[PDB]
Design a protein around this ligand. Sequence first.
Ligand SMILES: NC(=O)c1ccc[n+]([C@@H]2O[C@H](COP(=O)([O-])OP(=O)(O)OC[C@H]3O[C@@H](n4cnc5c(N)ncnc54)[C@H](O)[C@@H]3O)[C@@H](O)[C@H]2O)c1
Length: 692
Amino acid sequence: TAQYQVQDGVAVITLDNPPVNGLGHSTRLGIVEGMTRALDDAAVKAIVITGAGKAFSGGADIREFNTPKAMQEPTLHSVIRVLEGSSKPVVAAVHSVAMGGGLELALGCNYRVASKGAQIALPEVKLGLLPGAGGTQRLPRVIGLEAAANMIVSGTPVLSEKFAGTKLFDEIVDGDVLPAAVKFAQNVGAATGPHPKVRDLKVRHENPEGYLGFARNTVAAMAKNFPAPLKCLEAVAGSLKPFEQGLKQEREGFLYLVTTPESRALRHAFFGERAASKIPDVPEGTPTRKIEKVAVIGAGTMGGGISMNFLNAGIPVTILETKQEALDRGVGIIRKNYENSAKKGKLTQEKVEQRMGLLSTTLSYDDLKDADLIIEAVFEEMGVKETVFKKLDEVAKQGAILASNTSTLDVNKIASFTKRPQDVVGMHFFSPANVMKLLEVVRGEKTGKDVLATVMQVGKKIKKTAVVSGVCDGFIGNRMIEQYSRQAGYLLDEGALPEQVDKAIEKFGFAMGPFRMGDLAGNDIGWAIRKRRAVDKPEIQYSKTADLLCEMGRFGQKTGAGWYDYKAGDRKPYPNQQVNDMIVQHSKDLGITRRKISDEEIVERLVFALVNEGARILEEGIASKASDIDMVYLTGYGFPLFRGGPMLYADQVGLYNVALSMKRYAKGYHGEAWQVAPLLQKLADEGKGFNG
Ligand SMILES: NC(=O)c1ccc[n+]([C@@H]2O[C@H](COP(=O)([O-])OP(=O)(O)OC[C@H]3O[C@@H](n4cnc5c(N)ncnc54)[C@H](O)[C@@H]3O)[C@@H](O)[C@H]2O)c1
């Protein structure tokens, strides 16, 4: 809504829709109703528009995105139209935040006055759109083409006081904006003659094609599969035309971006991060335990990684090791990670020391006595875990939460080594744990709901995207990546080589293909894993190619040699002759006439195996919703942000067509991998998606 108050011949319209005065329907209507009242009232000679609380306005109200109310009139286009055609002069009084539609509204007013320290932005590019209510046209008219292009392409905020000597603000003040804006309004409302409009100004620039040519290149190079940034630049270029043409060209830009799958993807990512925290049977308002101090068992790469997340947030950690060398080795790796980030400009050295100052080291379980959360990050062997969870079940205070960073061991079994299984939980971080955003939270059968609520809240405090998975081999991410890695192997049998598969799937948009990834993880890890599949009650086949590779001791980057070769301090993975002859021999030995596999088939086989298994995961309820699987693959596996995740991608492709492709692959090599998940078949039969 909008408050309306007359004071001293000035109507003040005050946007009020916390937390950021989102321009929702009721607020938009409110601004117009107020303007109607103001023009009607003879005593009112000028108008001030401002915002309550901690914003002028942060733009579109996100709680309206998917509603009709988003587009219900008056729209922002209609509101602005009302402000520009106002016979009485309109002064925007900006403070704190003026972003997106909020800036656009301010630019629609005759005059603008700001206080210092206000954040100014058009961030629409971050959602794959562009400023669609005149921003691309009015902004370059008040700050010039280059400054405007830069704000709009990048979406980055800029403090109000940095616009001194542009026309954006007619007066920049210290102190409160409103008093100064009312005084401003009083003067202008006592002159007549008509009042200026941003649309009458002209973008003056002495070589547009000079600049735009260079901007085109740098934007194209940085933009990489996102079409919004170039369209924003194009829209801004239109500010050189007469206002109405520019605006028509902007609207077309907007409507084109709105159709693109890339902005569908960014929107899915944005809302998926928010929906990740929702668990079907744990309602908001379920109360959480206070987590003030943390302990970690293990100072290896994970343990040291996990710890840094808590330190970065200001939460003290106590790392426990067996030996004083493993400790002082880990603490040194932590410190080397930080001082290093500091040289790349990610932190000051001061910040490094305040972080290291929150880290404690012990060799003894008695120091973990007042830790609210303890995270086990030790070797993957049930025997060792049993030792740690027994020692922890003695010491840990009553109410502490005990978590395992296991990625392969049964969380429920680790829990029954204690007499408080309701307090045990998976917290599966992803290597490197201080950079990868993904936290997989594994809910045990016994895990209490209060424990789950707490872990999610913690997740948020350490800036992870935390997704709840039930218990099964590989949880959500690894269970899916196994099916993907199986198709990769099978593609080698049939006629692919590692570099070929990696390059195809990297061009599709993965950060790193299956072979490069296995080389980075350590190919032996997977070797260990598969060897307890044929042991345990399954007989799922894999291509023997990865076994063979490991029988040569080509374990990856750690041995200097995996599917490729690696030379020191050199980023390139070099294709290896011994590996590629092994792959070609193996095909010879299997009876297979190797053939030419298309990049399209590589991608389809790999990505559709993620989708098939994701569909079984949803049917089993190991993930509560499809957007969570997507969030796992964006934040854990380097699935391209521009496609939104495997499950959104399959919907974009169309489930009916994904199903058909699968039935064709059911007839080729290892056809049993391509039976169609029943949930996928059913959604395909009914013309629905996983997401919508
Ligand atoms: N499930 C997985 O495969 C997976 C996934 C992520 C992390 N993790 C575990 O976290 C580790 C991080 O690095 P790392 O193992 O290379 O070296 P690490 O140093 O973290 O391995 C565990 C450390 O804990 C210590 N340790 C072993 N047993 C212990 C016990 N009973 N009590 C106390 N301390 C003990 C050892 O000094 C060892 O250095 C991972 O590498 C892995 O072992 C496992």
